[PDB]
Amino acid sequence: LVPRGSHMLFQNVSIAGLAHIDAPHTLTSKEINERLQPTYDRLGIKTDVLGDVAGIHARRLWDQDVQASDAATQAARKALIDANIGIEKIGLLINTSVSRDYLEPSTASIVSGNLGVSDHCMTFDVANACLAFINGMDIAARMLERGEIDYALVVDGETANLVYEKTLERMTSPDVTEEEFRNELAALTLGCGAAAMVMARSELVPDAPRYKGGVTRSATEWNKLTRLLLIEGIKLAQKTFVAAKQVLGWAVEELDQFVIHQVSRPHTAAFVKSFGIDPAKVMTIFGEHGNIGPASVPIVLSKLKELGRLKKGDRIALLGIGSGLNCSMAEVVW
Amino acid sequence: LVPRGSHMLFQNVSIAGLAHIDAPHTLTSKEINERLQPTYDRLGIKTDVLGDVAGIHARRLWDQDVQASDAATQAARKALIDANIGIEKIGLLINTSVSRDYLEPSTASIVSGNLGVSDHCMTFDVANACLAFINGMDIAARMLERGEIDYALVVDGETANLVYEKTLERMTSPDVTEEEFRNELAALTLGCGAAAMVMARSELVPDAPRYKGGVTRSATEWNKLTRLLLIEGIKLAQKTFVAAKQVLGWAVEELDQFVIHQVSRPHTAAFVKSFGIDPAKVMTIFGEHGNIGPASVPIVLSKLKELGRLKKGDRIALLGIGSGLNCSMAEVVW
């Protein structure tokens, strides 16, 4: 009768499989700058904003015209192998990417057709900027917990190639203003990649990492959003941490790894300092892969898994601040 | 221990409030044809495909540059009044529209900011062509059933004005082929409008209509999709009806109303005939409002409610075939 924080946590949801795809092509910020240099000089800007300010040394792009659905499919095939299960077991496939093949059908339906899902497989896309993979995990978890399905795929493929192409053209225009030039620099922090996760009912996969679920707080009063954005983002993260304390029992010092969505080196620095987080517990791929949107979190988690340092029982915080503004925080126990 | 179909149905989820917005501006197919006539003649086509074939006599457009979020917000304000609750009670807001303000943030976050949701309100968009409102209802229902939230908004605003503007220009081009002309005619079956629903835990709203949930089947092998589309759509609907029998206990003759997504008059005729459905139990707004995408179903349900014929206990089938292909069928008991 009496609510407790722990009551809303998932007790029977696990991560059966996890995979990521690294986009193959390294575009260094050094190479990008060589092309921007004339516009940098002309504008009188001495600042290597990419390398020294945003803190990105390289990002990965696709070599070919990869669609979001292609990248998500490739990650999903790899995640199924990691879980050692066939596609026929999948009862739900959710796509969470910002990148999108078409207006219709859903990117999820395209990935599902590529994989050969059965006619029982439910599919749809969830869109929520950089936080959507966590949303997708939670939506799948609720179906798993209820027993409506036994296995789910959550997938996310991102492609920035076209954004880079268009952006580099506008920024090297003879009539580009320093303002426009600045406003467009931010696209050059984006990167390509993909991730997929197979979630399952725990009884089917004893000893797999457990997904506990988590919390969300919002500040939709700031859906218009500068230094103001960082300030409001941090304030929202503060209230979300309170919610995490109340539901997950989180105390910063008791978490073993923080898998954090990253916007830039300085944004991450400010977040980490604000909450007293130990930098050594924050794996970052931003410097060499850039910001892969909602795929960033599961790609980092996947990279942590394959590095083999995680121990059974490790408490892993998944979190990010997304446009909205929204903030989500969730826990995996390895 | 032993699964039964009824086990996955929601026992504690109700519809507290429901509203729709009719777009104000009537664009008749007569008026549209007057503009197409020269291209019709030039092409030698005697067929009034819109009125006599698709069976659309008019569609509604917005009078001004209405964004999806504006239309959804207007419907949501109306649905809150119908439920007699303030926005502060809402713990989740899902947007399900095809129409989209921006790439980011979510349309849901924009609507939520407009309405003044609290910081506890979770928000995201679900995209699944014409079936997404049903998906959103189900996602909200699972949170309500678990007790994670007490009230949810599911919203959907659609705008086709720009599609109409661009389409009418391409179809009246001196060099337009009969093929292209045909391929583009289909956009002229779309209409504008909005709908919103407040869902709630049943104990908070005794005597409100109950949402039981439903089933989905897919045929993602046909995600590429002609007469073939109608054929495959019907085959998928047949398998979904079997699932509905197995879960909801559906027999066609025992349902009181069918609220069906509509693609065209003949598509609807073929569907209704295939399943032996009584036309008198199928409210249609397509002839005067066209196809409002994923808002079509809740708009028709809302219009049924305000007409006041529904009786406590009436069994209402919600269904549609969406691109994917997907098919979803769900039940409301009034």
Ligand SMILES: C/C=C/C/C=C/CCC(=O)[C@@H](O)CC(N)=O
């Ligand atoms: C730590 C402060 C963070 C400020 C938030 C910035 C928004 C970030 C982005 O624009 C993308 O990286 C992801 C997103 N908005 O969902």
Ligand SMILES: C/C=C/C/C=C/CCC(=O)[C@@H](O)CC(N)=O
């Ligand atoms: C009865 C047969 C139906 C064929 C299906 C056609 C697809 C319909 C549409 O294209 C939109 O109206 C909605 C949608 N595709 O989700």
Ligand SMILES: [Mn+2]
């Ligand atoms: Mn290369």
Ligand SMILES: [Mn+2]
């Ligand atoms: Mn008018």
